[PDB]
Amino acid sequence: ASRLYTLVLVLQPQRVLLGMKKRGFGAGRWNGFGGKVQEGETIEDGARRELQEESGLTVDALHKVGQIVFEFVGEPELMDVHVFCTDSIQGTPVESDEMRPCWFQLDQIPFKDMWPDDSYWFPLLLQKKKFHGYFKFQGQDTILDYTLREVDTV
Numbered sequence: 001a002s003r004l005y006t007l008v009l010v011l012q013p014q015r016v017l018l019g020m021k022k023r024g025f026g027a028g029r030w031n032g033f034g035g036k037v038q039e040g041e042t043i044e045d046g047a048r049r050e051l052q053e054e055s056g057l058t059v060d061a062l063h064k065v066g067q068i069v070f071e072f073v074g075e076p077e078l079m080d081v082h083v084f085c086t087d088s089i090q091g092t093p094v095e096s097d098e099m100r101p102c103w104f105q106l107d108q109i110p111f112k113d114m115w116p117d118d119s120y121w122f123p124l125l126l127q128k129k130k131f132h133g134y135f136k137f138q139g140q141d142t143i144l145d146y147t148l149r150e151v152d153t154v
């Protein structure tokens, strides 16, 4: 009862790229770039595909940074999110009907307008740590419970 997702953070030495979602899942918030993995598709291929579809950017090297399982109470399916990061990209971010990309200085990451779990694992991401996490949500704003631990192997 867990569905595979990817999430890609474009993280450079002094800034991170996030995308403001205009409609649908995550709308109104700054998000990394991700979505469902397709049939016959590897997780890494899915992550590379999602980055392109949502941001316009071509990624060469992707690094595994974490896994986060999300539960929304009253919803049967868990989100099994494989998180990736990259520093080497090609192209420039593309604004679309769906997504408005913007760079943020690391000290100006807009946590108040991001999913609340971000405040927990972004510090790990920013210091190049790998992690396993689990977040139980009620609705989209409230974390009921969570666990988060650093790992050597995602």
Ligand SMILES: CC(=O)Nc1cc2c(c(-c3cccc(C)c3C)n1)CCCN2
Pocket (backbone or CB within 6 Å): 005, 006, 007, 025, 026, 030, 031, 032, 033, 034, 035, 036, 070, 081, 114, 115, 116, 117, 118
């Ligand atoms: C930084 C960031 O994106 N944080 C972030 C946090 C977060 C989610 C997502 C998310 C948003 C859109 C699509 C997908 C597949 C995912 C996992 N992203 C989904 C649900 C709970 N928390």
